[PDB]
């Protein structure tokens, strides 16, 4: 009969979950600009999660997409297409200090 006790409700102050930069985006092997965004400019490397900062599924998605874009040849392997070097940079790498 104690009406001042606590309630067994869920947490109202719960913070909304964070989102990969692509969460519910659509990764296609067709936009090479997008895939260029996640590749090292000098190498043609594919950045890891710890750089790109993507969900699991979106990393995997991006990777496969890239490889497809390479064999089908919309995108080259060993360097970032120069056209796209001047575009917005997503990743956390600092090369030049």
């Amino acid at each position: 009969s104690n009406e001042d006790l606590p309630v067994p409700m869920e947490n109202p102050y719960k913070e909304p979950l964070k989102k990969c930069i692509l969460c519910e985006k659509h990764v296609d092997y067709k936009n090479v600009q997008l895939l260029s965004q996640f590749i090292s400019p000098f190498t043609g490397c594919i950045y890891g999660r710890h750089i790109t900062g993507l969900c699991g599924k979106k990393q995997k998605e991006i990777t496969k997409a890239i490889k497809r874009a390479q064999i089908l040849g919309f995108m080259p392997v060993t360097y970032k297409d120069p056209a796209y070097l001047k575009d917005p940079k997503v990743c956390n790498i600092k090369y030049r200090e």
């Binding site: 979950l17 990969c20 067709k30 599924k57 089908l72």
Partner: protein
């Protein structure tokens, strides 16, 4: 749409181009295919130089053919594309729009793993 055809074609003038595309979709419509659409992605300088049919190409035209086809067929069309003298590289992919978008709800944060090692009062 079911299947997708990435056509990289030898860069030509317009008439020859038209010819090539036309006969391509003819071949497909003959193997039993229903063509949805034709998307010209332009003539680009290829990311790298591609050697096929004893010609090493720098540039190429890019095309996208969405179509429905029966399972048995895809091999046939691939063969007839590989045979072709002006295709600078063929491919056929399950059309991207069959694949579902299952909502990233977000990052499910992973907590540090506990109860790996036994409790021991060592040192």
């Amino acid at each position: 749409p079911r299947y997708e055809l990435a056509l990289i074609l030898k860069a030509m003038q317009r008439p020859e181009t038209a010819a090539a595309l036309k006969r391509t979709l003819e071949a497909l419509m003959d193997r039993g295919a229903v063509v949805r659409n034709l998307e010209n992605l332009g003539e680009r300088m290829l990311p790298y130089k591609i050697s096929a049919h004893n010609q090493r190409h720098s540039r190429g035209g890019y095309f996208l053919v969405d179509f429905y086809a029966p399972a048995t067929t895809v091999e046939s069309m691939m063969e007839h594309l590989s045979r072709d003298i002006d295709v600078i590289r063929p491919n056929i992919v399950k059309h991207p729009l069959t694949q579902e978008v299952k909502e990233c709800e977000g990052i499910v944060p992973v907590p540090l793993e506990e109860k790996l090692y036994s409790t021991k009062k060592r040192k």
